[PDB]
């Protein structure tokens with residue numbers, strides 16, 4: 612059985628060969644990442660005399676077209692940040708090779724899920740969480756500039772990569788599921804643990820969905836575990852409610868999917884449909900360990916983890932987890948918050 616004249620496997624992927632030369636330019640070294648889209652290889656660019664990462668898209672029309680959207684968004688973004696100061700991965704060029712679209716990037720290190728694994732799922736320090744938070748908010752401020760207006764739509768630890776294994780600098784990757792404010796098309800978006808209430812409820816959405824995901828990500832980076840680990844959409848909404856209470860009535864009264872999760876009382880108030888902790892009783896104050904030595908008590912007696920530090924982090928996270936997307940904190944104001952260092 613032969614796929615793509617022998618070049619592909621039965622998964623639509625290119626069969627990588629160590630040392631292969633492409634186009635009198637690139638020498639392929641080895642596989643360094645993989646996912647639903649295809650593969651990422653380390654390769655030497657002999658023209659520019661540098662190592663690069665090549666994202667080799669599957670040879671299949673749905674995967675090709677997803678990547679063509681990504682290329683257009685990257686070309687728009689990189690063009691408005693030629694100094695590469697806004698924390699988005701740099702697309703150098705693209706080409707078609709043996710029926711695969713190939714995207715050439717600067718080469719990065721480990722992703723933030725890999726980093727959590729390296730902590731044995733116990734979390735990184737509050738100081739490193741703060742560095743990651745400040746860079747992510749800067750990236751979201753850039754995506755919100757009007758000529759872009761880009762919603763990433765799939766933020767999670769595995770889509771944030773370190774630049775270098777010994778340093779805190781990061782870049783955001785994977786714009787294949789992204790869209791622009793003026794061209795919103797998708798009803799079903801965001802990976803479940805990081806999915807915003809407005810999406811769960813079938814309501815209109817905007818760039819605020821990415822700020823919701825960021826709040827969830829930052830808690831998990833410090834505790835080691837996902838904040839809201841639902842098995843399905845009903846479980847996901849119930850896990851959100853355990854921490855944050857019943858959503859406001861002004862929201863539920865306008866939500867097409869309200870009755871998937873809630874019921875309206877004669878009061879006019881809303882409650883859950885019929886095992887969970889009562890609404891709002893799983894306090895973020897206790898998940899973080901504000902007054903009890905951090906997650907698991909493991910930060911007791913460590914510098915950089917005072918009660919005061921934890922109260923500032925809690926305040927910022929609760930603003931990122933506002934149920935109302937009109938009042939949820941926006942990137943400009945997140946960057947001004949006293950959790951961040953002045954200079």
Ligand SMILES: CN(C)c1nccc(-c2cnn3ncccc23)n1
Nearest residue numbers: 644651664716717718719720784785
């Ligand atoms: C080391 N690696 C893995 C790497 N290095 C540079 C860039 C990328 C990269 C660019 N887009 N995507 N999308 C999805 C997953 C990875 C990437 N990966």
